């Protein structure tokens, strides 16, 4: 019932500002999730598919963003880097079910689309399940000024580049990550 709109969606936000959508007090099926070979990776870390038909639908979360193809391998527990230190840090605990699948024809046109953004510079790397939308200059060099973007003062975001003539590891993969909790 509830998540028929979080997979077929025509608009996925970029990674640095995702959309945590909770579902509550409504039935779920999870047979739409498995028995479909359209997905690339269907890793689940704590609980097992074809078993989670228990009383778990107390605010089941579902994050969603878009990253390049060989950075699905940083949406594992642990596994530090540059898309899991500053954008989406999973805990060393129960991540629900990290799900990813190739998308070259939906979020990428012939003109070299670069509309999706990801952070590159952030001191004091992220806690588990925390979002950072604060667009402020880095200021890692000289004395704190009002922001001039000249030298050793970088813009905190950067585009990707999603041409359809790239290989596998530079094409956008629409990653959706479930999460579960109790009371």
């Amino acid at each position, epitope marked *: 019932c509830p998540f028929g709109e979080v997979f077929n969606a025509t608009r996925f936000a970029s990674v640095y500002a995702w959309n945590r959508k909770r579902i509550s007090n409504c039935v779920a099926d999870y047979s739409v999730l498995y028995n479909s070979a359209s997905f690339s990776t269907f890793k*689940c*870390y704590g609980v097992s598919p074809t078993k989670l038909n228990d009383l778990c639908f107390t605010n089941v979360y579902a994050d969603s963003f878009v990253i390049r193809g060989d950075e699905v*391998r940083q949406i594992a527990p*642990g596994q530090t880097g540059k898309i899991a230190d500053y954008n989406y840090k999973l805990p*060393d605990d129960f991540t629900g079910c990290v799900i990813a699948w190739n998308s070259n024809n939906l979020d990428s046109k012939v003109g070299g689309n670069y509309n999706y953004l990801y952070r590159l510079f952030r001191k004091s790397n992220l806690k588990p399940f925390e979002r950072d939308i604060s667009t402020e200059i880095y200021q890692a060099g000289s004395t704190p000024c009002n922001g001039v973007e000249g030298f050793n003062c970088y813009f905190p975001l950067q585009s990707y580049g999603f041409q359809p003539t790239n290989g596998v590891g530079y094409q956008p993969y629409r990653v959706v990550v479930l999460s579960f909790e109790l009371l």
Partner: antibody
Amino acid sequence: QVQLVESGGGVVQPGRSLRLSCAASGFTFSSIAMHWVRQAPGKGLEWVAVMSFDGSIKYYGDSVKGRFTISRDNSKSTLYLQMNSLRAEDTAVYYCARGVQGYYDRSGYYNLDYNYGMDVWGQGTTVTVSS
Amino acid sequence: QSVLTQPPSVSGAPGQRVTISCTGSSSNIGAGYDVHWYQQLPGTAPKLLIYGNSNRPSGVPDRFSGSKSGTSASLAITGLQAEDEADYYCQSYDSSLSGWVFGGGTKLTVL
């Protein structure tokens, strides 16, 4: 805080056995897989054995097929490797390297993960087989 | 000897770009698995450098990048300095032997 310290190297005649130790601290040992890799002195690295999350899935390399035995314990956070019928080509520095975690796919069977490397490596002790 | 084949020793001048090739068979790398890369400083324990064919963990700088072109991947160092004289082993996973494979080791030095 995260490190893997070992002990247990020595001089063994070819034919008798030895137990290898690999202590663990700084992280959660009770959920992550573990890998053993060895280095011949001068030559490159080679793979030895892997142990899964719970202790039901094990694999070994090509040169150690059957004549080795791996077993761990989550309680005292210590990883063991038992050997018997040793040869003279096993004289190598033995590392224990932390693996990645593990996953259940749709079908639902735990699968050791294959696409990940070995993040943090131990200091590694040397064994010596000679006459 | 080893399952993966790579050049045993290649080097170059500082500030230039060196390609450490790492080619394998169609049973392990070409089957759909991901290469990785290590860096063994002389006399010590290696560290992870690149995993998942393009990434870099927390701590390794921006100079060490890589790729995976079909059935033969390659590591690329841009702006190399004197403090990187170590060896660089590439590894993968194999479906036939059902075990991890490694490389022959590349001796990279500065001139």
